[PDB]
Amino acid sequence: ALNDPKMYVQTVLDVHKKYNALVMSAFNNDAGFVAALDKACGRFINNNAVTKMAQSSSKSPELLARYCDSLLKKSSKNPEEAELEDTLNQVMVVFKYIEDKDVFQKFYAKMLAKRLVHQNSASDDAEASMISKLKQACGFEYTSKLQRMFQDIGVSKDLNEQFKKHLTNSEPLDLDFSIQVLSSGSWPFQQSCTFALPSELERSYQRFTAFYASRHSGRKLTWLYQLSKGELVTNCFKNRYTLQASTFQMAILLQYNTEDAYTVQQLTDSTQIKMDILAQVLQILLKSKLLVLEDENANVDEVELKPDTLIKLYLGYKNKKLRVNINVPMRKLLIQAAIVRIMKMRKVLKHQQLLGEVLTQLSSRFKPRVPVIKKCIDILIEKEYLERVDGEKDTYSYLA
Amino acid sequence: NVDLENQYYNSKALKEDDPKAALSSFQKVLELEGEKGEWGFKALKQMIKINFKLTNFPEMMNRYKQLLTYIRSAVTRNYSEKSINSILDYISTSKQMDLLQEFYETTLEALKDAKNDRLWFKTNTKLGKLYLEREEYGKLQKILRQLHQSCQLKKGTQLLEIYALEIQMYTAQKNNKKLKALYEQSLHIKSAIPHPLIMGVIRECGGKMHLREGEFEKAHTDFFEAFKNYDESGSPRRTTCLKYLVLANMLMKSGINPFDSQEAKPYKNDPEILAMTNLVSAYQNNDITEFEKILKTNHSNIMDDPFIREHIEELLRNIRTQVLIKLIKPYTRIHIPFISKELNIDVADVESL
Amino acid sequence: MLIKVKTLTGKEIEIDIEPTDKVERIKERVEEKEGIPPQQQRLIYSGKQMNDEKTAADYKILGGSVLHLVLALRGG
Amino acid sequence: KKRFEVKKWNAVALWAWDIVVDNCAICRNHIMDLCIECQANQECTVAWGVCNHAFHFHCISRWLKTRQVCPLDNREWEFQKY
Amino acid sequence: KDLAGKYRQILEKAIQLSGAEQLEALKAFVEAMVNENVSLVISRQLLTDFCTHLPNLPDSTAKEIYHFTLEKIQPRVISFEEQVASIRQHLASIYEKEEDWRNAAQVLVGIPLETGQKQYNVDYKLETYLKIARLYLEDDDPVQAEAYINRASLLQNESTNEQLQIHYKVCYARVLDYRRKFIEAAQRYNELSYKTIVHESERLEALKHALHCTILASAGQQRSRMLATLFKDERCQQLAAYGILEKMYLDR
């Protein structure tokens, strides 16, 4: 199951459905048959045995998120939107049975980010349907991050087509420029690695910022060059090569515009890339045999990548593959006590009214953050502590 | 196989502006393509981009029947719809009534038989926007009724798109009775993820119907939401809900400067909303002398549209009331003519107030 | 061995235990004596509140130590 | 005519507000002051909502005593990120 | 190959010229550096060396070259985003040395500190914002100094420079005093007078400014309690306005 959990998930789906049909025929709601159902699914499925000695326990309940990712990810011939919906419908029913739904929204949000920003998402219309279904489960606050991620994808799509119209009124760009503006505070991505923009891509850069100054006022742009790709062609080789590479590989290849060979130190100094990231980029470039060094007999494994080796562009590049693509991926217990203490005096309190009375009354030490207090109050009301009102507004009450 | 990998790059990277040569090579691609590959559509799109300019319409009717079939299964939904938008948008201003009329008739019937769920829904909505912008409200209703009658919840995204189209059409019809019903209908939908342009028409007419009725607080919430969504997507209409945002904020007994949030601060000094910025800066910290001067100077920027002229009577009276209340605070006996000189109104009007 | 617990008012109860007995056992014995729930009751020795996980190893008296019982509301 | 030409570049950005915050719209003092009330008696800290609107803790606390909405957007005010 | 040897010799000699012929040499040579044909290894690096030698040349001549260079870097700013910061900072010093606050403030304003790909450190942004507010204050423009003192307020909380926080508080009190908020500025000045880090000479200056602001403040509950605190201070007798403070405290 650990090696190939793909078919492990499919086993659970088939077993559950057939159990209901057999009972209603002759058993007539037998006491013994119904009782044995709740004991088998809980212990055997929710937490399996091999999660203990394999030092991997958090990943076990998280294999459901990747299953739904595979259905909405760009792949080969996929099932049509006629039989897939009904299988997803019963998935919602079993989802409420799990208690740690918070981690579900985290992993699905991170996986959705990589699917959308890289244009690897399939059936984008169906993606809105999937997120809409998750909204009904808990609320818009539960899917607050997810909805914003999908919204800015549509905004950027209309922004690019509006940018094309703006290009006709000015000098046409020598390259096709498309950009996902994304958003700050709603995405897992963040700028971490500094980068020197190549002189070829600067002008378009500036152009776009102008388009983002007239359209939007008081808005910055934190470009993520590690998440940007592009297509680069060669006009001096024997054959035309339209390679697809990230911004880092693009800059490394474009550095050979003026010369033929460079050392690692000059590459590091000119592009200001960190040692580890640049080492990984150089290694994956060497895997594609795009750049070679003087000594073929030298082994890259037992010889450290010292920042002095002179790598030269291989002018007789005749690699047998015409489809080169180097763009492949490389305990506190204080807040619960405070909550019960503040609910002692006031029998009935709103959720947000209770927040602040505990969130920031003791904020001078151990700033608690909203989600921690939400989770603690959830595990409290679960264990016969708050027993919130049956639906009248959002009062949480006490022993009522 | 081996030749498919090599030939496609040669015919794509090399633009081959010379005609009567690249046509033959691309023709062999479609017939020889046996596998269920995506590369067939990409080369097939090139002839539409280049050879469409050089007439050759009789050639295209023969090739159009099999063109739509590849959308279903050869490529994904996102790629098929993306290629359509670029070509169709720029030919709208190119006139060609003889092309636009006959193309839509034959395409709509063929696509209806195959796709009904989502691909047909968006294309028909796009055509509905075309009817809306052409000021032709005689054939939008027929396609709107068939769009609306698809349910009889779980389809909130599609329902809100229809409601936005109805609201936009009735705005041009000068209809107010239907606007109330449409806005309340959208309130029952709580599971929609629409574009931030769809929820800028529903949330703008909701603020306007609240403005007319007299609920200035609910209008402020609707105008803030509409302005925020118009800021994310859109531009020309964004600096129209901001003016109504400030006016609604002045009609809720003031309080809190609208130009303090991060969304409205950059547009505070914009020339279009500069007059309203000074209006709210004078409404708060009540001073009638400055408030009246701004109204007199910016007569063609404030007292122009009926949505602000009508409510200018409610203003210039609340600010006068607040000045009056503060003025009479430290007095046990005051002169009515003395009040009139401070309020800049007649003695008879002071007694009525 | 056989200790005495006194409340604030001065009421004395004599409860018998073993050296390996836990403080939860003390609270349960007081419950069987009067009826006080263990969570609504606090035990003090030498002016320091007992922790709820230690089996009376440093509370060795061998002569009936005097314990202090304080009523408190559930969870403070 | 150029020796080497770039054909495509799919960039990715991350827009953010140029000015993070410059005022608390309940006391008109910016978010690093004491909310006037803490100025008289010496604490004051920031508070955010789901609308990402920042106010002083004390200001929004006394605003929530009688109301239940965000002062700026007039929406349901829920505390977020302390 | 020929670029490294020949062009290095010609650049090092041409910088030493006599008179007006120097300007003509820089016009054609700088334009050759802006050209796209020059890679960003012999243009970005040597521009820093070119700029560090400029302050030695007289300030009167340095103004014209500094302005001309900024115009030529404008088409390609993102590449030379670090030279612009140093060039404009150097030019602001020359403008302030000529008792020209408006020009110095505008030059420092043009530096991209938020809308830029170079992430300047908190200390750099804090000290630049304080200088801009101070220069605007010297131009009798409280509105502009208020705007740039708000930005510096968001960086002083997390800055590790203890001295820079004192500088920010001094400028903040001056801005409040300029904005005719005397009662609020008096309290800020009073806090500064109680800091042992600040020198005694300026400590009395802060006390003098606090007393002047309290006297100029509007009469009321807050002003009366500030007067009592100042009178109870034993260092107020050294100020030339102690006699007025005594009468004002006694409600005379």
Ligand SMILES: CC(C)n1nc(C(F)F)cc1C(=O)Nc1ccc([C@H]2[C@@H](O)CCCc3cncn32)c(-c2ccccc2)c1
């Ligand atoms: C005698 C003590 C130790 N005590 N024994 C037992 C019992 F469980 F054993 C229980 C207790 C005990 O401290 N109770 C208590 C309960 C409530 C309050 C506050 C509370 O409501 C908060 C609102 C104000 C209030 C008005 N009237 C009671 N209060 C207090 C209390 C009163 C003054 C100062 C501090 C605390 C004590």
Ligand SMILES: [Zn+2]
């Ligand atoms: Zn405040």
Ligand SMILES: [Zn+2]
């Ligand atoms: Zn405060």
Ligand SMILES: [Zn+2]
């Ligand atoms: Zn808000």
